[PDB]
RNA sequence: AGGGAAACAACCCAGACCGCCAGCUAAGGUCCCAAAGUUGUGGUUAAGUGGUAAACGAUGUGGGAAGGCUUAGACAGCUA
RNA sequence: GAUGUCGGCUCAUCACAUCCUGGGGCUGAAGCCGGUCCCAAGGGUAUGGCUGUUCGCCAUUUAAAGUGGUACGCGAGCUGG
RNA sequence: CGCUGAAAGCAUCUAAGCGGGAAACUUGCCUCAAGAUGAGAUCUCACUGGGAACUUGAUUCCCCUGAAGGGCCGUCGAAG
């Protein structure tokens, strides 16, 4: 019978990603791939086996074309006519961390495994992170 | 699942699944996906010894 | 301005300019020849 | 900053000219400072404020030790005010001395609670007829939504229930008189809440 | 022909502190002019100046003409004083400059007190004449347009602040 | 029945006797949801075209063969 | 082997092809006023006589008395004209 | 509504760049708001005893201890 990973016997590593001009979508797909764990031979769809990801610059991210002044982010509050929108340029100045999180959130399963994988993503808008004890290793150099 | 595991094991060695199967088919190694995903996880040395020969096949 | 679907010159002083992706028409002699969209 | 007092009923005073000034008398005990939340340890900047007269048997040991860092011997309740920039020591006394004539202020406080109010009283709805053939429905709400394709009732719909004692603030009430001897504030207008309640007086930012 | 090919032939007193990416012109009668040119450019150093692009695209061909003219404007700014002659037309209109304050009377209830920016200094030889002296054409024109926008001209009377352009609209009915 | 067109008895591929944790293909795909090319070479397109739409309008841009004048001085502008 | 049809009252929600308020271009716009056309849905947008009437005509205002969708909204909320 | 400015020696509000700009947009005024499972943050208070089996973040059980405080109950409220 084929081997299946066990959550009690899983190995997970810490990585740090520097987004200082990286394309939003081409960075988010690598982050989501490494969060789901498609880079390991022992990948299982039913249990999570992935590596923690740390983003240190959530405001230097780059979007190509005229999407800086476009690409509205819609969402509804629940009340009638509660539709609200904000563009990339205004959102990246207000909440830089939520710009890149929503891209990865829409690129994971919509099951409770997706929520667990999303909790391993930890973005920061500054230049340093509070995970020096974990000692993440640089990748994508 | 076996295809996904073999692709993950091969990308760590420096190939892709589409090129790996072609390299295997340039010769006739004839190892199934069930017994390539098992070697990808447990027998990593044997999987690497298969992948290097697939690279040597130049395909 | 004069919103249309076919902007065109009306006198020798009309110059057609594409401003911010919109085909504008500006006339230095007759302000009535100014046309916005087309 | 602001001042915490008690509503004590409304009154009226007459000026020399002849006009009547409706007044709400606000009793203000001298207020002690309990904390001074600096920015380095708390983020924002604010100051705690407390009124007196609470018996020792009703204060927990945690609160007794909290009121022991600053020698306050504090009483009922603790209120906090956000301030721009002004230094305050651990033990200080805030009185009515910071107010003057005019000086439009904002007055908050828990309003008088109606038990469980209908739609005519809560939302000022209009009632149906009373004689022209009407059935039992005379004051009940009418329709809620459209027939087939809202598919539901929209959230935020105005319905009956609990005209409550929730916090409400009357904006920009001018002070008529300040008493530094009896510790009173005379505010021109109404104040939310019943007499003998708790009221917060702050300078008006709307101006 | 293409303006980018013509040289600049800077006058006597000019200094070129060219750092490759950031050019700077210093001279008498105003100084401290500098511009960060687009990256895709070539700038030589000699008695004159010439500009040339690297990639023959539809963008750099226009960038070369734009930057040559910008450098020419910077050179002329520290050699000749830019001016904008604005004249007031209408009864009861006057301008009274008080140093860095230019107060105008345009028939409004309150007197507008337009504050000039740094560098530009305006002078009023008459009550119906403004002379906006400066070092940068862009800032001089912007200040002149902002002063003009308070009361633009009227075709039935000409009653409004207007500059030397004599193509003002005119109609009577 | 199955696979594809996001879901879509009638459209495309293909007709399930049963079992396999075996391999090759069709339509349709190979960045992540999602299995498989961030594969190789020569170009175009910047508008999110792709990812709805006609009359008609426009010195948008790439390519093709013919033309009219021109160092005897053209086309622009500057002076009569 | 049942989806209760027109008006009225109560309660509203949504589109802008906008009636008022807001910012502008042109005008055969002297001024006061106007006509036409872009941007704009934040808030407002009448009481009566007649008629079952929606609509419509009237008298009197108001800055205005908008056009539509929502089973020509709303009868397990009311009337049965 | 513009200023500099070429492509296209002029002109040109735009291709780069620099401005003004309305009840719309985002702050500013008021209320709820860490079930914000990302569950945040400051001050203060309370607990400092042993034994056995079995396996070892060591688990389970016996006795002694029950503090900070909370609840029960009662007198009530311009709270319900
Ligand atoms: Mg779902
Ligand atoms: Mg614009
Ligand atoms: Mg009450
Ligand atoms: Mg009755
Ligand atoms: Mg019904
Ligand atoms: Mg539904
Ligand atoms: Mg195959
Ligand atoms: Mg895949
Ligand atoms: Mg039935
Ligand atoms: Mg519109
Ligand atoms: Mg607003
Ligand atoms: Mg109906
Ligand atoms: Mg009934
Ligand atoms: Mg907490
Ligand atoms: Mg005790």
UniProtKB/Swiss-Prot annotation, chain B:
One of its GO terms (molecular function) is structural constituent of ribosome. The keyword Ligase does not apply. Keywords: Ribonucleoprotein, Ribosomal protein, RNA-binding, rRNA-binding. The keyword Transport does not apply. One of its GO terms (cellular component) is cytosolic large ribosomal subunit. One of its GO terms (biological process) is translation. Binds directly to 23S ribosomal RNA and is necessary for the in vitro assembly process of the 50S ribosomal subunit. It is not involved in the protein synthesizing functions of that subunit. Belongs to the bacterial ribosomal protein bL20 family. This is Large ribosomal subunit protein bL20. It comes from Pseudomonas aeruginosa (strain ATCC 15692 / DSM 22644 / CIP 104116 / JCM 14847 / LMG 12228 / 1C / PRS 101 / PAO1). The lineage of its organism: Bacteria, Pseudomonadati, Pseudomonadota, Gammaproteobacteria, Pseudomonadales.
From Swiss-Prot, chain C:
The keyword Ribosomal protein applies. GO terms for biological process: translation. Keywords: Ribonucleoprotein, Ribosomal protein. One of its GO terms (molecular function) is structural constituent of ribosome. InterPro entries: Ribosomal_bL36, Ribosomal_bL36_sp. Pfam families: Ribosomal_L36. GO terms for cellular component: cytoplasm; ribonucleoprotein complex; ribosome. NCBIfam families: rpmJ_bact (TIGR01022). Belongs to the bacterial ribosomal protein bL36 family. This is Large ribosomal subunit protein bL36A.
Swiss-Prot record, chain D:
InterPro entries: Ribosomal_uL3, Ribosomal_uL3_bac/org-type, Ribosomal_uL3_CS, Transl_B-barrel_sf. One of its GO terms (biological process) is translation. The modification N5-methylglutamine is found at residue 148. Pfam families: Ribosomal_L3. One of its GO terms (molecular function) is rRNA binding. GO terms for cellular component: cytosolic large ribosomal subunit. Keywords: Methylation, Ribonucleoprotein, Ribosomal protein, RNA-binding, rRNA-binding. Methylated by PrmB. PANTHER family: 50S RIBOSOMAL PROTEIN L3, LARGE RIBOSOMAL SUBUNIT PROTEIN UL3C. Belongs to the universal ribosomal protein uL3 family. One of the primary rRNA binding proteins, it binds directly near the 3'-end of the 23S rRNA, where it nucleates assembly of the 50S subunit. Part of the 50S ribosomal subunit. Forms a cluster with proteins L14 and L19. This is Large ribosomal subunit protein uL3.
Swiss-Prot record, chain E:
SUPFAM superfamilies: Ribosomal protein L6. Part of the 50S ribosomal subunit. Keywords: Ribonucleoprotein, Ribosomal protein, RNA-binding, rRNA-binding. The keyword Metal-binding does not apply. This protein binds to the 23S rRNA, and is important in its secondary structure. It is located near the subunit interface in the base of the L7/L12 stalk, and near the tRNA binding site of the peptidyltransferase center. InterPro entries: Ribosomal_uL6-like, Ribosomal_uL6-like_a/b-dom_sf, Ribosomal_uL6_a/b-dom, Ribosomal_uL6_bac-type, Ribosomal_uL6_CS. GO terms for molecular function: rRNA binding; structural constituent of ribosome. This is Large ribosomal subunit protein uL6. GO terms for biological process: cytoplasmic translation. It comes from Pseudomonas aeruginosa (strain ATCC 15692 / DSM 22644 / CIP 104116 / JCM 14847 / LMG 12228 / 1C / PRS 101 / PAO1). Belongs to the universal ribosomal protein uL6 family. Coiled coil: none annotated. GO terms for cellular component: cytosolic large ribosomal subunit. The gene is rplF. It comes from the Bacteria.
């Amino acid at each position: 019978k084929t081997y299946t990973a066990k959550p009690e016997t899983v190995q997970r590593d810490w990585f740090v990603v520097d987004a200082a001009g990286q394309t939003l979508g081409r960075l988010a797909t690598e982050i989501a791939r490494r969060l789901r764990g498609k880079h390991k031979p022992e990948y299982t769809p039913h249990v999570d086996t992935g590596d923690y990801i740390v983003v240190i610059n959530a405001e230097q991210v780059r979007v190509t074309g005229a999407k800086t002044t476009d690409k509205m982010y819609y969402h509804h509050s629940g009340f009638p006519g509660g539709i609200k929108s904000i563009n990339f340029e205004k959102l990246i100045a207000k909440a830089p961390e939520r710009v890149i999180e929503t891209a990865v959130k829409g690129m994971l399963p919509k099951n409770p495994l997706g929520r667990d994988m999303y909790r391993k993503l930890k973005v920061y808008k500054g230049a340093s992170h509070p995970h020096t004890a974990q000692q993440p290793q640089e990748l994508k150099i | 699942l076996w295809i996904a595991r073999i692709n993950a094991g091969a990308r760590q060695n420096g190939l892709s699944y589409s090129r790996l199967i072609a390299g295997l088919k340039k010769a006739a190694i004839e190892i199934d996906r069930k017994v390539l995903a098992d070697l990808a996880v447990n027998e990593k040395a044997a999987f690497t010894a298969i992948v290097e020969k697939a690279k040597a096949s130049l395909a | 301005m004069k919103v249309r679907a076919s902007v065109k010159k009306l006198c020798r002083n009309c110059k057609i300019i594409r401003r911010d992706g919109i085909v504008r028409v500006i006339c230095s002699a007759e302000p009535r020849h100014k046309q916005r969209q087309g | 900053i602001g001042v915490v007092g008690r509503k004590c009923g409304m009154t009226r005073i007459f000026t020399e000219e002849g006009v009547s000034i409706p007044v709400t008398v606000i009793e203000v005990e001298p207020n002690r400072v309990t904390q001074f939340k600096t920015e380095e340890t708390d983020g924002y900047r604010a100051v705690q404020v407390t009124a007196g007269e609470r018996r020792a048997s009703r204060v927990t040991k945690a609160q007794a030790g909290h009121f022991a860092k600053a020698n306050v011997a504090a009483g009922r309740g603790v209120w906090e005010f956000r301030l721009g920039e002004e230094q305050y020591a651990a033990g200080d006394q805030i009185t009515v001395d910071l107010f003057q004539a005019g000086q439009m202020v904002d007055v908050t406080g828990e309003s008088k609670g109606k038990g469980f109010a209908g739609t005519i009283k809560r939302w000022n709805f209009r009632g149906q007829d009373n004689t022209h053939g009407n059935s039992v429905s005379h004051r009940v709400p009418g329709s809620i939504g459209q027939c087939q394709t809202p598919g539901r009732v929209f959230k935020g719909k105005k319905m009956s229930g609990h005209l409550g004692a929730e916090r409400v603030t009357v904006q920009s009430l001018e002070i008529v008189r300040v008493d530094a001897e009896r510790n009173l504030l005379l505010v021109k207008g109404a104040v939310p809440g019943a007499t003998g309640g708790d009221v917060i007086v702050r300078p008006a930012a709307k101006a | 022909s293409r303006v980018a090919k013509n040289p600049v032939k800077l006058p006597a007193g000019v200094e070129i502190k060219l750092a490759g990416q950031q050019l700077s012109i210093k001279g008498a009668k105003g100084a401290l002019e500098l511009k960060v040119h687009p990256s895709v450019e070539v700038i030589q150093d000699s008695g004159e100046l010439r500009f040339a692009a690297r990639n023959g695209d539809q963008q750099t061909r226009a960038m070369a003409g734009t930057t040559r003219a910008l450098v020419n404007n910077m050179v002329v700014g520290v050699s000749q004083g830019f001016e904008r002659k604005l004249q007031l037309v209408g009864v009861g209109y006057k301008a009274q400059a008080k140093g860095q304050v230019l107060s105008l009377s345009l028939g409004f209830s309150h007197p507008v007190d337009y504050e000039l920016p740094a560098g530009i200094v305006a002078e009023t030889p008459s009550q119906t004449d403004i002379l906006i002296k400066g070092i940068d054409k862009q800032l001089v024109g912007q200040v002149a347009a902002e002063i003009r926008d308070f009361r633009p001209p009227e075709p039935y009377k000409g009653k409004g602040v207007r500059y030397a352009d004599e193509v003002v609209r005119r109609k009577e009915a």
